[PDB]
Design a protein around this ligand. Structure first.
Ligand SMILES: CCC[C@H](CC)Oc1ccc(C(=O)OC)cc1NC(=O)c1nnn(-c2cc(OC)ccc2OC)c1C
Ligand SMILES: CCC[C@H](CC)Oc1ccc(C(=O)OC)cc1NC(=O)c1nnn(-c2cc(OC)ccc2OC)c1C
Lengths: 293, 288
């Protein structure tokens, strides 16, 4: 810990603080979410059916009393069986994104940036910081993202563990979990993703790139000061590689998402703004940035 | 063979059953589902731990929603399924009220004896219908798209067969009764002269004797006589066991209601909570 500059210490101290105050590990305040109800365009339909089959999951909504609802998704047959859990996942991604917005809103280096670069940075890193947070609740053995009450469990396939790791996002979660990262390396990862200066729309490239660098320098140091075991050799460069891969996956799933919205509109109002004057077009985002935490 | 009157007796009952029993439960809509004085509270917790089951809802999409019941905590949790079973009971009671009306023998009775017979026969007729959807292998009442599965209680069939009502369903299902024999049981149960509030005792007793003789005669005629020699008596004993079970669960319901009111308005009438004035809903249902 001392091996880190007092500036670095305070930097991990602020990031971890913002994570605790803005990340709901228990999803306890995740409420009012929708649940599954109790030719050229046809080629587009065929593409979407492959996207959704990779991320087929069952939803286990546990209850304080001890009860457990479990939804087994319908097997694909015709149309819209596939879009059954989509209204829910949209509600849950918005709840996730709102905490990512609040994470950044608490960080000093982010709070001082021009509001149009706060909007643009969050637009580029919303998925990446979401997936990084989801990884912390991912159970590699069960194949479940354990989100407090709700648990999303990967549906068993015929291809087995081999068929799953074909999906880049499922592979990303399994590889990143394998690294057994500390909370500090996750929040530092989330900050290197957030402060990416090459995102579309960022106009303070220098300030953001200078900030990103010091986040990676703090990450390389923390790994040097708190991780001397041989399994963690090249852990930093492994982490940095994964972040580059998450940017690749972020791009893949910005395309899958837009295609689904084209076929079957499902996006919440805020999610439509992620996918589109900056302040004017992103009215809900601008509002939330201005609000307190 | 059966007398032509007896044949017509069965014909009417089977007709009533066909018009008033939704075997797929396809019209059981809008039911409440599980969301997501110290003496009375513990007695109630004892009552509710005997018949724990897991609701399963199956969608047209092929999705399955499964409600595992909440492990007993003796609190608000224990009453999680009551708001639902209260809606199931009402839906079932309304179909039982309707069964009785289709029967000419019941419509002729005085409107006050109709209320009394239904008051004492509603539970029995409900459980008789539930048995026709009971799957003894899977321990599940298959109510069309809803399935209620008796949850393993760690004692296997031993603990369940202890509970007189689960024993009843298993025992009755082993009798492999016909649809005609099920509906005749309902009549024999409905037209019971010893029920509280009856005034035409001889009229009802005579009617129940004619339904029972039809059932006795049906078995002799339409079943290998030597093997099913005592089947009619087996049935009569179960109707009797059901009258005893009716009372136990009529008390469980009153105890569970005083601690926490789950009852729908029609159920409250059924449990005593002029006679035609004390049961105004049920009266309306009988004259519409
Ligand atoms: C359970 C949580 C983790 C798990 C990882 C496999 O997740 C799913 C499970 C199953 C499905 C699914 O098959 O049901 C359609 C979909 C998702 N995952 C998103 O639904 C999703 N994850 N991130 N984002 C997203 C969020 C943004 O704001 C933060 C911005 C852009 C985004 O781009 C896709 C979404 C819509
Ligand atoms: C559909 C499932 C069949 C299975 C057979 C035993 O049933 C249950 C399973 C589980 C439970 C349970 O887990 O408990 C919350 C409760 C019941 N069963 C009643 O809830 C119930 N069944 N019949 N009646 C009733 C009806 C009346 O008029 C029609 C009048 C009085 C009645 O009761 C005294 C009730 C309240």
């Amino acid at each position: 810990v001392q091996g880190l500059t007092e500036e670095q210490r305070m930097m991990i101290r602020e990031l971890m603080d913002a994570q605790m105050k803005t990340f709901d590990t228990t999803f306890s305040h995740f409420k009012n979410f929708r649940l599954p109800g109790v030719r050229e365009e046809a080629a587009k339909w065929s593409q979407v059916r492959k996207d959704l089959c990779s991320l087929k999951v069952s939803l286990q909504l546990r209850g304080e009393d001890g009860s457990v609802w479990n939804y087994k998704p319908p097997a694909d047959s015709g149309g819209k069986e596939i879009f059954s859990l989509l209204p829910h996942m949209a509600d849950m991604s918005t709840y996730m994104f709102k905490g990512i917005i609040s994470f950044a809103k608490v960080i000093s280096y982010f709070r001082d940036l021009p509001i149009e670069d706060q909007i643009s940075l969050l637009k580029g890193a919303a998925f990446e910081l979401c997936q990084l947070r989801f990884n912390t609740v991912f159970n590699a053995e069960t194949g479940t993202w354990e989100c407090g009450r709700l648990s999303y469990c990967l549906e068993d396939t015929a291809g087995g563990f081999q068929q799953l790791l074909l999906e880049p996002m499922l592979k990303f979660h399994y590889m990143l979990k394998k690294l057994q990262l500390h909370e500090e390396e996750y929040v530092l990862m989330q900050a290197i993703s957030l402060f990416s200066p090459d995102r579309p729309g960022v106009l303070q490239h220098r300030v953001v790139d200078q900030l990103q660098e010091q986040f990676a320098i703090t990450l390389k140091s923390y790994i040097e000061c708190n991780r001397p075991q041989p399994a963690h050799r090249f852990l930093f460069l492994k982490i940095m590689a994964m972040l580059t891969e998450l940017r690749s996956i972020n791009a893949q799933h910005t395309q899958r998402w837009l295609r689904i919205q084209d076929i079957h509109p499902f996006a919440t109002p805020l999610m439509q703004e992620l996918f589109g004057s900056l302040t004017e077009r992103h009215k809900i985002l601008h509002r939330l940035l201005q609000e307190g935490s």
